Amino acid sequence: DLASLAIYSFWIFLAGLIYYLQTENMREGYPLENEDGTPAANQGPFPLPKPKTFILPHGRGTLTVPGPESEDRPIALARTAVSEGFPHAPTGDPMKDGVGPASWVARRDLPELDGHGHNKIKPMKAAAGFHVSAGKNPIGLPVRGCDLEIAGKVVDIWVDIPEQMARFLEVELKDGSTRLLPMQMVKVQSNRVHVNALSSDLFAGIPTIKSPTEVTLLEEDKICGYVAGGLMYAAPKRK
Amino acid sequence: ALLSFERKYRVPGGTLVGGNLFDFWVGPFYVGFFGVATFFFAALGIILIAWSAVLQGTWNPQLISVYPPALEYGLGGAPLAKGGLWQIITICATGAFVSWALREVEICRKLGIGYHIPFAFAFAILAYLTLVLFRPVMMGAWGYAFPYGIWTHLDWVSNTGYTYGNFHYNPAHMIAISFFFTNALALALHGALVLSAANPEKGKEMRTPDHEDTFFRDLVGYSIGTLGIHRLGLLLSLSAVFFSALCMIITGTIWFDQWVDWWQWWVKLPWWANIPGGING
Amino acid sequence: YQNIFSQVQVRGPADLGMTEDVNLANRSGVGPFSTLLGWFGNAQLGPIYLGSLGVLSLFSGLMWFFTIGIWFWYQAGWNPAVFLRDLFFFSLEPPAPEYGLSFAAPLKEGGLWLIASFFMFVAVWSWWGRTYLRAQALGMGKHTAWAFLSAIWLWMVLGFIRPILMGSWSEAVPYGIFSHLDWTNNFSLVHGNLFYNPFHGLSIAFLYGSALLFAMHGATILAVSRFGGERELEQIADRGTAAERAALFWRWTMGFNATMEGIHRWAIWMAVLVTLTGGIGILLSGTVVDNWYVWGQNHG
Ligand code: BCL
Numbered sequence: 086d087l088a089s090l091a092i093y094s095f096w097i098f099l100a101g102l103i104y105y106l107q108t109e110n111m112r113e114g115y116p117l118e119n120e121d122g123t124p125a126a127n128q129g130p131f132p133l134p135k136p137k138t139f140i141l142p143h144g145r146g147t148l149t150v151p152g153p154e155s156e157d158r159p160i161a162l163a164r165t166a167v168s169e170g171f172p173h174a175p176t177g178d179p180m181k182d183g184v185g186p187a188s189w190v191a192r193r194d195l196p197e198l199d200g201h202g203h204n205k206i207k208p209m210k211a212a213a214g215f216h217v218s219a220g221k222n223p224i225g226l227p228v229r230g231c232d233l234e235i236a237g238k239v240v241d242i243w244v245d246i247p248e249q250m251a252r253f254l255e256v257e258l259k260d261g262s263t264r265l266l267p268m269q270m271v272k273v274q275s276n277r278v279h280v281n282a283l284s285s286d287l288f289a290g291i292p293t294i295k296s297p298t299e300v301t302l303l304e305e306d307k308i309c310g311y312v313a314g315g316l317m318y319a320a321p322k323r324k
Numbered sequence: 325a326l327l328s329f330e331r332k333y334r335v336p337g338g339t340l341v342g343g344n345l346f347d348f349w350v351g352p353f354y355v356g357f358f359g360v361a362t363f364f365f366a367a368l369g370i371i372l373i374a375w376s377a378v379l380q381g382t383w384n385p386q387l388i389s390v391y392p393p394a395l396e397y398g399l400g401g402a403p404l405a406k407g408g409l410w411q412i413i414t415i416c417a418t419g420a421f422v423s424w425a426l427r428e429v430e431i432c433r434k435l436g437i438g439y440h441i442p443f444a445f446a447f448a449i450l451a452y453l454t455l456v457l458f459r460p461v462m463m464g465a466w467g468y469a470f471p472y473g474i475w476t477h478l479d480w481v482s483n484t485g486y487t488y489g490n491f492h493y494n495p496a497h498m499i500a501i502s503f504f505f506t507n508a509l510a511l512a513l514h515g516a517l518v519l520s521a522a523n524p525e526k527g528k529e530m531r532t533p534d535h536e537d538t539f540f541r542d543l544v545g546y547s548i549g550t551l552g553i554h555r556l557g558l559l560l561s562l563s564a565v566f567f568s569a570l571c572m573i574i575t576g577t578i579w580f581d582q583w584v585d586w587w588q589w590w591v592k593l594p595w596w597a598n599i600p601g602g603i604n605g
Numbered sequence: 606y607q608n609i610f611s612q613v614q615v616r617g618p619a620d621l622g623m624t625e626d627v628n629l630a631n632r633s634g635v636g637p638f639s640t641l642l643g644w645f646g647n648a649q650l651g652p653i654y655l656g657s658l659g660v661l662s663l664f665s666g667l668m669w670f671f672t673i674g675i676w677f678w679y680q681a682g683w684n685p686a687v688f689l690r691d692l693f694f695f696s697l698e699p700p701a702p703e704y705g706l707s708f709a710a711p712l713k714e715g716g717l718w719l720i721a722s723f724f725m726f727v728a729v730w731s732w733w734g735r736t737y738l739r740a741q742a743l744g745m746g747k748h749t750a751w752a753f754l755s756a757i758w759l760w761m762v763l764g765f766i767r768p769i770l771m772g773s774w775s776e777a778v779p780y781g782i783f784s785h786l787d788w789t790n791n792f793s794l795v796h797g798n799l800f801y802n803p804f805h806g807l808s809i810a811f812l813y814g815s816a817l818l819f820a821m822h823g824a825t826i827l828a829v830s831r832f833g834g835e836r837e838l839e840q841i842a843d844r845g846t847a848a849e850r851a852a853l854f855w856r857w858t859m860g861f862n863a864t865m866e867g868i869h870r871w872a873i874w875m876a877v878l879v880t881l882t883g884g885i886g887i888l889l890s891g892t893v894v895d896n897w898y899v900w901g902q903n904h905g
């Protein structure tokens with residue numbers, strides 16, 4: 086009958102949808118590799134989709150996925166076991182080496198542009214006329230580390246112009262250089278910013294930016310990676 | 325086997341229990357102590373459900389049904405065949421879900437991300453624990469809990485519903501449903517917007533977050549934004565399940581009459597109770 | 606700090622948005638900035654693009670809304686005490702079966718229901734044309750309009766398609782808070798319990814999955830917002846450690862994972878399949894199956 090035909094029809098549709106959906110989600114990360122970087126033998130039942138090509142705006146070219154997959158950077162890790170499936174130990178300082186929770190991707194060394202082709206993220210000093218409209222203005226507050234030691238002071242907010250939100254605090258360290266910290270890893274308080282992820286001594290080690298008025302996708306990744314890795318790696322210094 | 329980018333993240337640490345001892349993977353799956361916990365609780369629970377299917381005398385998943393102990397057993401233990409198996413399986417299920425949550429916390433710690441996902445999962449565990457633990461214990465029998473079986477748990481829904489007339493009239497149920505419908509509306513839009521930007525009209529460039537905000541302002545005069553819609557989805561869905569648990573913890577306990585009749589609190593208020601005409605005069 | 610609310614708002618000049626091919630003549634100017642809204646999302650109200658389909662929808666949708674309320678006031682004997690008291694209890698009911706699919710029915714026993722429904726029909730379809738046209742203006746895909754059509758499907762079935770196939774407007778849903786609930790419960794009883802409708806049960810799994818998936822996704826983007834996770838489009842064109850840590854959380858949890866684009870295809874589909882399966886379930890109820898218990902007993 087019409088109802089039994091409909092429900093059978095639907096279950097076959099759903100099987101085809103789930104196939105289509107699964108191969109779409111294989112456009113990054115695939116094919117699978119062994120720990121040595123060579124391609125795994127067993128890829129599972131789903132094949133790689135036909136590539137698609139995104140035309141990126143503002144003349145920044147195209148992306149074709151799936152395409153050739155490399156890290157385009159060295160990975161300072163060594164095997165801890167003689168068989169697959171165990172952890173890979175850092176060979177140096179995982180923070181400096183950008184491994185584990187300190188991992189960054191080698192994204193493009195350009196800044197994200199807005200719809201009009203202007204830099205998405207400026208310091209608030211170069212953004213007319215952006216102001217703090219609500220909440221505690223953190224500018225001029227001392228920045229404290231998880232060792233309960235002062236690392237510096239906030240000297241500006243870097244804002245997302247089109248999204249109208251704060252993305253980083255620019256911090257002036259003891260030596261007069263500045264670093265970006267992500268908004269999402271700091272606690273703005275009445276009388277300080279607290280940064281749990283890093284102890285005061287690890288603020289100098291935060292990756293720095295080439296231009297003082299712009300930050301690139303590569304730089305965002307090294308800074309964000311670095312600060313997140315603190316939760317694991319600056320644990321001996323957390324009180 | 326590893327994703328092309330995965331190895332740099334397979335570092336030691338982030339375990340809550342037993343240091344480096346269970347700190348390893350099996351294929352794509354991370355293990356950890358709560359990996360071992362989850363398997364123990366899950367295996368034990370499946371063994372018990374199979375042994376329950378023996379005593380019932382059927383190996384059909386459309387018939388198998390592990391029932392709570394009957395009301396007369398109260399909050400006491402029961403014979404395995406006549407409620408005790410459920411009681412143990414329920415402990416085993418609770419062990420599996422909590423273990424799964426704490427495993428997600430270990431994965432969070434290794435990856436240096438926030439604890440939002442297992443915090444969200446905790447709400448589903450609290451819905452489950454309402455139905456099989458908190459409500460039953462407040463009512464005074466494990467018998468008031470739902471049975472484990474594919475169609476027998478739907479009977480339980482319908483029979484528990486119609487004990488209180490049309491269960492639509494539960495006001496906390498009304499709120500919960502509104503969040504379920506809204507969450508689904510929001511998920512449809514969120515996926516549709518991002519895809520409409522990443523996959524524009526043939527030959528054109530990827531759109532920008534600015535297009536996403538423009539499109540919405542153009543349509544309904546407001547745009548919540550890329551961070552806000554992810555805050556919204558998480559809030560709408562945790563709200564639906566919160567009010568779901570609330571709507572059932574009050575049913576059997578503070579309210580045990582027909583739910584339609586509860587609406588008389590409003591109709592019988594002194595200042596319009598006796599005013600003739602309308603539906604209720 | 607966990608990123609559910611902002612710790613600091615910033616504001617700059619009003620954002621009049623992208624231009625592309627939009628007719629700027631039909632956009633308003635900015636409205637207020639809500640600092641309240643701004644803790645959760647954006648502070649800016651407006652602009653809104655009106656235009657012709659904008660006004661048609663908006664007038665038409667108010668005519669539907671007023672038509673129902675004018676009848677609610679009438680039922681209340683024009684008394685504001687009775688009105689507020691009985692608000693959830695009033696109902697504009699469709700024509701009796703007697704009048705079948707006819708437009709003959711008097712205002713007080715159907716005709717008024719039909720008037721309100723006509724208005725609602727113009728309001729919804731014009732608004733659908735609007736979600737397509739706004740997207741076209743900006744050169745974006747029609748995803749939003751096709752996803753909206755899935756919601757329109759179930760509505761069209763309940764009030765129009767099924768009342769036509771069954772040969773009576775009385776089969777349609779009444780405009781009222783408690784009345785539309787009674788209808789729903791009545792429908793299930795009369796068709797042998799919708800729990801045995803296999804489309805109703807899929808509808809629920811998808812409603813469910815929508816709640817579970819947006820819970821997962823929202824949580825996941827907040828968890829990786831410390832690496833700019835919310836910037837989904839640029840993470841699509843140039844995968845960052847946010848996309849990677851997100852994919853790997855889920856791979857390590859449950860054995861497989863999504864792309865930053867791919868999760869949004871999961872999302873749009875989980876949701877449209879709610880009203881898609883829902884509408885099929887309802888269309889088949891009383892047209893082809895009298896009783897889902899009885900049908901289930903044969904399986905077919
Ligand atoms: C005739 C029946 C009555 C009725 C009687 C009831 C009764 C009784 C109940 C509801 C409940 C609900 N009703 Mg009602 N309800 C009715 C009509 C409706 C209608 C409608 C359109 O008519 C809607 C939309 C709803 C909607 C709802 C929701 C608000 C709620 C269910 C969601 C929930 O609690 O999730 C919560 C989610 C969970 C419990 C899932 C938890 C998952 C766990 C943690 C993990 C499981 C892991 C798994 C075992 C692993 C599997 C293996 C893997 C695949 C590897 N009802 C009718 C009128 N309704 C329920 C409620 O509010 O519950 C508290 C409830 O008990």
Ligand code: BCL
Nearest residue numbers: 370452470474475477481805806807809810811813814817
């Ligand atoms: C929420 C309020 C009610 C309830 C009311 C209803 C109503 C009404 C319906 C269901 C339906 C379902 N319910 Mg229920 N259900 C309840 C609580 C549960 C619990 C639990 C808390 O432990 C589980 C595991 C289930 C599981 C199920 C599925 C069999 C089915 C689709 C769920 C879905 O898509 O979710 C979303 C999750 C996903 C999409 C992820 C995948 C989950 C998979 C499919 C779950 C497999 C469960 C498996 C069969 C259980 C045994 C596994 C053990 C390890 C051995 N329900 C409570 C008591 N449930 C529908 C149905 O058609 O079933 C007959 C349906 O119409």
Ligand code: BCL
Nearest residue numbers: 756757760789790792793799800805808809812883884886
């Ligand atoms: C006693 C009651 C019966 C029952 C009788 C029915 C009937 C009858 C129906 C359902 C339907 C559904 N039931 Mg049921 N259902 C029961 C028990 C349940 C239980 C449970 C026990 O837990 C659950 C979870 C559900 C869940 C569901 C949903 C999956 C489904 C509705 C999907 C939806 O999103 O529609 C909500 C979305 C819409 C209706 C789309 C509307 C879109 C339109 C275009 C929007 C118009 C807006 C307008 C202009 C106003 C403007 C507003 C302002 C601008 C803000 N039912 C019991 C067994 N159920 C429906 C279904 O899909 O059938 C399977 C349905 O018709």
Ligand SMILES: CC[C@H]1c2cc3[nH]c4c(c3C)C(=O)[C@H](C(=O)OC)c4c3nc(cc4[nH]c(cc(n2)[C@@H]1C)c(C(C)=O)c4C)[C@@H](C)[C@@H]3CCC(=O)OC/C=C(\C)CCC[C@H](C)CCC[C@H](C)CCCC(C)C
Nearest residue numbers: 366369416417420421424444445447448472473816817820
């Ligand atoms: C709170 C918002 C929504 C939500 C959130 C949510 N769910 C989650 C998560 C989150 C954030 C996870 O991280 C986690 C996950 O991994 O998702 C893929 C999960 C999860 N939610 C799941 C399911 C699920 N969630 C549901 C609901 C919801 N989840 C809400 C709608 C439902 C519904 C609506 O019914 C289901 C069925 C799983 C896919 C997963 C949890 C997996 C888990 O805990 O694994 C350990 C346990 C086992 C492998 C099984 C052990 C078996 C038992 C020992 C015996 C059987 C017990 C059971 C009572 C049998 C009953 C069956 C009958 C009722 C049919």
Ligand SMILES: COC(C)(C)C/C=C/C(C)=C/C=C/C(C)=C/C=C/C(C)=C/C=C\C=C(C)\C=C\C=C(/C)CC/C=C(\C)CCC=C(C)C
Nearest residue numbers: 670673674722723726760761763764765778780781782785
């Ligand atoms: C206070 O006073 C004021 C002035 C503000 C007025 C007050 C208004 C109030 C209080 C209104 C309240 C309204 C309420 C509570 C309405 C609730 C409605 C609900 C819950 C609707 C539910 C479902 C509706 C459905 C399914 C409708 C479907 C409609 C269609 C599919 C269209 C069908 C079209 C028909 C029959 C006519 C087609 C004719 C032609 C010629 C094409």
Ligand SMILES: CCCCCCCCCCCC[N+](C)(C)[O-]
Nearest residue numbers: 103107117128129131860861862
């Ligand atoms: C409820 C539907 C969700 C489950 C869909 C099944 C997806 C399994 C895909 C396995 C992917 C394995 N591999 C090797 C490609 O990573």
Ligand SMILES: CCCCCCCCCCCC[N+](C)(C)[O-]
Nearest residue numbers: 220610611612613641642644645
């Ligand atoms: C859903 C839209 C409306 C949301 C409004 C909620 C306001 C939250 C206020 C947060 C208070 C600010 N604080 C102290 C956390 O910085």
Ligand SMILES: CCCCCCCCCCCC[N+](C)(C)[O-]
Nearest residue numbers: 545546633634635636650651653
């Ligand atoms: C979802 C509710 C949001 C609605 C916001 C709409 C804002 C309208 C702006 C009014 C300004 C009108 N005018 C003519 C001065 O530009």
Ligand SMILES: CCCCCCCCCCCC[N+](C)(C)[O-]
Nearest residue numbers: 103803804806807810814874875
């Ligand atoms: C986006 C795809 C997700 C697939 C989720 C499907 C869940 C399975 C639900 C089985 C219910 C079948 N039933 C009993 C209604 O016939």
Ligand SMILES: CCCCCCCCCCCC[N+](C)(C)[O-]
Nearest residue numbers: 128129130351352353859860861
């Ligand atoms: C009926 C719904 C349940 C479906 C669960 C599917 C889980 C898929 C697990 C993917 C792991 C694949 N593997 C082992 C090759 O990596």
Ligand SMILES: [Fe+3]
Nearest residue numbers: 518822826837
């Ligand atoms: Fe997203």
